[PDB]
Amino acid sequence: SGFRKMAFPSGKVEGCMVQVTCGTTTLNGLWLDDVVYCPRHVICTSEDMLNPNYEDLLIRKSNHNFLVQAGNVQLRVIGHSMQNCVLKLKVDTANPKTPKYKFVRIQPGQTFSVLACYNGSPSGVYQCAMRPNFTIKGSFLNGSCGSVGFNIDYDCVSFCYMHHMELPTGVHAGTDLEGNFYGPFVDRQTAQAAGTDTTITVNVLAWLYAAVINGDRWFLNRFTTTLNDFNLVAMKYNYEPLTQDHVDILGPLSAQTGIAVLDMCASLKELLQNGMNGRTILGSALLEDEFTPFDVVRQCSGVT
Amino acid sequence: SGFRKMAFPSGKVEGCMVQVTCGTTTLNGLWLDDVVYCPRHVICTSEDMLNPNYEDLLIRKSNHNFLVQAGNVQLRVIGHSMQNCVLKLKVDTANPKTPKYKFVRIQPGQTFSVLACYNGSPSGVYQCAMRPNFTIKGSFLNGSCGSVGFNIDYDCVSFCYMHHMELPTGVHAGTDLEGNFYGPFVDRQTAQAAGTDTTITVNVLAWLYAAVINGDRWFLNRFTTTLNDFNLVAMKYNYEPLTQDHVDILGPLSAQTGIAVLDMCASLKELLQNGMNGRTILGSALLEDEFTPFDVVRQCSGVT
Numbered sequence: 001s002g003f004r005k006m007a008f009p010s011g012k013v014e015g016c017m018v019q020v021t022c023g024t025t026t027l028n029g030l031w032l033d034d035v036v037y038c039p040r041h042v043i044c045t046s047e048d049m050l051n052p053n054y055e056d057l058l059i060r061k062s063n064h065n066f067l068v069q070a071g072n073v074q075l076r077v078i079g080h081s082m083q084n085c086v087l088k089l090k091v092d093t094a095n096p097k098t099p100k101y102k103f104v105r106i107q108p109g110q111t112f113s114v115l116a117c118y119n120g121s122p123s124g125v126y127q128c129a130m131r132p133n134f135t136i137k138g139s140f141l142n143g144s145c146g147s148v149g150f151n152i153d154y155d156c157v158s159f160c161y162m163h164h165m166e167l168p169t170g171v172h173a174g175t176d177l178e179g180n181f182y183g184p185f186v187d188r189q190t191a192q193a194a195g196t197d198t199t200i201t202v203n204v205l206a207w208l209y210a211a212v213i214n215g216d217r218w219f220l221n222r223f224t225t226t227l228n229d230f231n232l233v234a235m236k237y238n239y240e241p242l243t244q245d246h247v248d249i250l251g252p253l254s255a256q257t258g259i260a261v262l263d264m265c266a267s268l269k270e271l272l273q274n275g276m277n278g279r280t281i282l283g284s285a286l287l288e289d290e291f292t293p294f295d296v297v298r299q300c301s302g303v304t
Numbered sequence: 305s306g307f308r309k310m311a312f313p314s315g316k317v318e319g320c321m322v323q324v325t326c327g328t329t330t331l332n333g334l335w336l337d338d339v340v341y342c343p344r345h346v347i348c349t350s351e352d353m354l355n356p357n358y359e360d361l362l363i364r365k366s367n368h369n370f371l372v373q374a375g376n377v378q379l380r381v382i383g384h385s386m387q388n389c390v391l392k393l394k395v396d397t398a399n400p401k402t403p404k405y406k407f408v409r410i411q412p413g414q415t416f417s418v419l420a421c422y423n424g425s426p427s428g429v430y431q432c433a434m435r436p437n438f439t440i441k442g443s444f445l446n447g448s449c450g451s452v453g454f455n456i457d458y459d460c461v462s463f464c465y466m467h468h469m470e471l472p473t474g475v476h477a478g479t480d481l482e483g484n485f486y487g488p489f490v491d492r493q494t495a496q497a498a499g500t501d502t503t504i505t506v507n508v509l510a511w512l513y514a515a516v517i518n519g520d521r522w523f524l525n526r527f528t529t530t531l532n533d534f535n536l537v538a539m540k541y542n543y544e545p546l547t548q549d550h551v552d553i554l555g556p557l558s559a560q561t562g563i564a565v566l567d568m569c570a571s572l573k574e575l576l577q578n579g580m581n582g583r584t585i586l587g588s589a590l591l592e593d594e595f596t597p598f599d600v601v602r603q604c605s606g607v608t
């Protein structure tokens with residue numbers, strides 16, 4: 001029993017973190033096979049970040065300008081290319097700790113673990129969600145750029161995020177491992193505001209199921225609702241509209257608990273309309289939305 | 305910017321997790337050098353757990369009854385001994401992935417990372433505190449016993465916890481790596497109630513400092529207080545009494561922010577007396593107490 005915000009074990013990814021230095025900028029790189037992936041803004045001075053022309057800036061860079069260090073050992077760069085907002089540094093040595101991996105571009109509402117690194121060295125691991133506004137609420141200081149987000153399925157690391165920038169509101173923007181930003185963000189020191197940070201309704205419902213499974217039940221009520229009625233309430237509270245797809249995904253938690261998805265929706269509706277009245281659910285005083293249905297099933301079943 | 309509940313990177317500990325099977329009970333072991341550490345209740349049937357005599361039960365066990373598997377490879381047990389509530393299984397092979405380590409017994413209020421494992425395989429990592437009542441609020445299913453809690457200082461893993469049992473209230477009890485329980489708990493399926501779960505005042509104040517550092521400031525007020533006055537309020541709200549030792553420990557965060565510890569105490573006092581009025585602090589609607597001052601400085605400075 002007990003339900004915790006849980007990250008994947010980070011070892012497989014720790015084995016992939018390197019330091020990339022171009023001129024006087026140091027950030028993190030991901031070493032998979034004989035390629036090191038890092039944010040293209042490694043080639044910028046903070047001066048350059050106001051309005052960089054990366055193709056023009058990159059012409060001034062050679063293989064030998066990219067200093068790549070894995071622990072205390074330097075990697076030889078034999079090639080470099082820009083793909084969208086990442087650089088791919090070809091090195092002469094395959095990373096011997098390369099796990100089985102994929103690059104996936106995640107949808108908003110999907111959760112992943114972040115291995116926060118500085119100078120190619122891990123500082124910590126925590127769990128995030130891709131927000132509906134394509135920001136993440138991370139913990140990232142200067143030097144953390146090139147830190148990656150990932151899921152693990154048994155033996156296969158799915159890399160979904162590389163950290164690139166902090167908005168002036170202190171939320172985070174980045175790319176998939178093809179260097180394409182999530183959302184409308186650009187790797188430039190300009191005015192970029194996040195849209196509405198909507199609540200991930202399907203994740204709140206998953207987490208309500210997790211609460212029932214772990215003994216927190218005070219918010220169960222005598223009511224039910226419809227998708228359309230529930231969605232009127234979601235709109236009012238800046239919740240994502242609940243679809244039948246979300247209902248289908250919650251089916252296993254519904255089955256396990258014997259609480260119909262629409263009954264749990266009616267519980268969530270009363271919580272939105274009435275608040276928690278100073279009570280808590282799995283040690284939270286607000287409605288948690290960074291556990292997916294798949295996360296609740298995984299943690300509640302003990303998958304490894 | 306951004307402040308997250310952050311675990312240590314788990315790789316160094318992932319390298320130490322093994323499966324221990326005695327008869328029909330499987331749980332996790334920690335392999336350091338040529339010793340595997342695991343909970344002594346590995347030798348029990350669930351029947352035995354009602355009133356086990358571990359010394360008597362252990363007489364019926366030989367080296368060859370302890371099946372120790374590191375991934376898919378079996379370790380040869382050449383010795384076994386009971387130290388308090390753990391078994392130490394001597395194996396014929398030193399763990400080649402043994403990191404630099406220490407065993408520390410932590411004080412209540414101290415935080416650590418848990419690597420939740422099942423069958424010697426990692427499922428996830430999360431951050432805990434030793435509660436003032438010597439429970440932890442974990443996420444532990446059957447098979448999770450022998451999962452360990454740890455801190456890392458650069459290259460040295462300090463192992464502070466091994467998971468042993470769940471109380472009927474769904475909080476967690478365990479031992480240090482010498483097999484001594486935290487608090488009054490015993491490895492027996494009996495009536496064991498946790499004492500008052502008091503709030504770790506010094507950790508709330510640290511986290512209030514973390515909030516200021518990361519832009520959340522609405523709770524700063526025009527007031528100050530004294531240790532004695534603050535402590536009257538702490539008593540009323542089941543907070544740990546604040547000592548000058550706690551004030552001294554918060555000195556660096558005080559210095560960095562320019563907010564006197566006693567002014568932040570007066571802020572915490574108004575939060576206790578008045579609630580959050582539906583507002584949040586670092587995305588929490590309650591006062592977080594599982595970040596130590598040392599945790600706030602580490603995360604806010606980017607230590608690796």
Ligand SMILES: *CC(=O)N1Cc2ccccc2[C@H](c2ccccc2)C1
Binds near residue numbers: 042141143144189
């Ligand atoms: C995440 C990180 O390490 N950054 C520091 C940095 C140093 C030098 C150049 C760029 C950057 C990153 C950045 C990206 C976009 C806009 C401003 C700054 C951030």
Ligand SMILES: *CC(=O)N1Cc2ccccc2[C@H](c2ccccc2)C1
Binds near residue numbers: 348447467
């Ligand atoms: C944590 C764990 O794996 N447990 C399962 C278990 C199986 C067999 C014997 C004992 C246990 C553990 C336990 C400890 C004390 C009281 C009851 C159960 C728990």
